[PDB]
Amino acid sequence: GMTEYKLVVVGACGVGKSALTIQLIQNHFVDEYDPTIEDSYRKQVVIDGETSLLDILDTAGQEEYSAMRDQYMRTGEGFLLVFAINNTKSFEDIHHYREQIKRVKDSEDVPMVLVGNKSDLPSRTVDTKQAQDLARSYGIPFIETSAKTRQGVDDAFYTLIREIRKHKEK
């Protein structure tokens, strides 16, 4: 068949996980989507001439850490680690998400992409240079996105898939 990849979108409440994922699937910006609704979505994509089926989990639920998520997270093949460029706390939380991913996957080498969302807003408080410095330190790609304009959205998901395909060849 065509290969199938499980992708997981993680990050703090309100960063735009749902807006991103719905943009990629439904081709429109859905604002104020309920913060607690979780869903999976499927999408066929062609990347570098190979067609793949993406199964994308948009994480939600209660606004705390819960180990009830972790069996689900262990099924992820690649993760988008999303913060909002107008929200310093959401950037500060990225460390915790990467540590939990490494813990559940029991690996130092899990496909991941750092996503700085809401790039359309003028209210940036997270310096692109500091987020780039963090991504360099982790050894993972960094893409600034806007779910609203769609800037960066496809490149974030496609770069993740590329990282997964490379991982699977090691």
Ligand X SMILES: *CCC(=O)N1C[C@@H]2C(=O)N(C)c3cnc4c(F)c(-c5c(O)cccc5F)c(Cl)cc4c3N2C[C@H]1C
Ligand Y SMILES: Nc1nc2c(ncn2[C@@H]2O[C@H](COP(=O)(O)OP(=O)(O)O)[C@@H](O)[C@H]2O)c(=O)[nH]1
Q: Please report, as ranges, the residues that interact with ligand Y according to CB under 6 A.
A: 11, 13-19, 31-33, 35, 117-118, 120-121, 146-148
- Determine contact, residues 115/7, Cβ cutoff 8 Å: no
Q: Select 69 or 165, whichever has its Cβ closest to ligand X.
A: 69
How many Cα atoms within 13 Å fall on the side-chain side of residue 143?
20
The residue whose two tokens read 């999976």 is 40
| 60 forms part of the interface with Mg ion (CB under 5 A) | yes
Residues 6+ apart with CB under 8 A from 78: 5, 6, 7, 8, 110, 111, 112, 113, 160, 161, 163, 164, 167
| 19 forms part of the interface with ligand X (CB under 6 A) | no
Q: Of Mg ion, ligand Y, ligand X, none, which one does residue 130 interact with (CB within 5 to 8 Å by kind)?
A: none
Q: Of Mg ion, ligand Y, ligand X, none, which one does residue 100 interact with (CB within 5 to 8 Å by kind)?
A: ligand X
- Give the footprint of ligand X on this chain (CB under 6 A): 10, 12-13, 35, 59-61, 63-65, 69-70, 73, 97, 100-101, 104
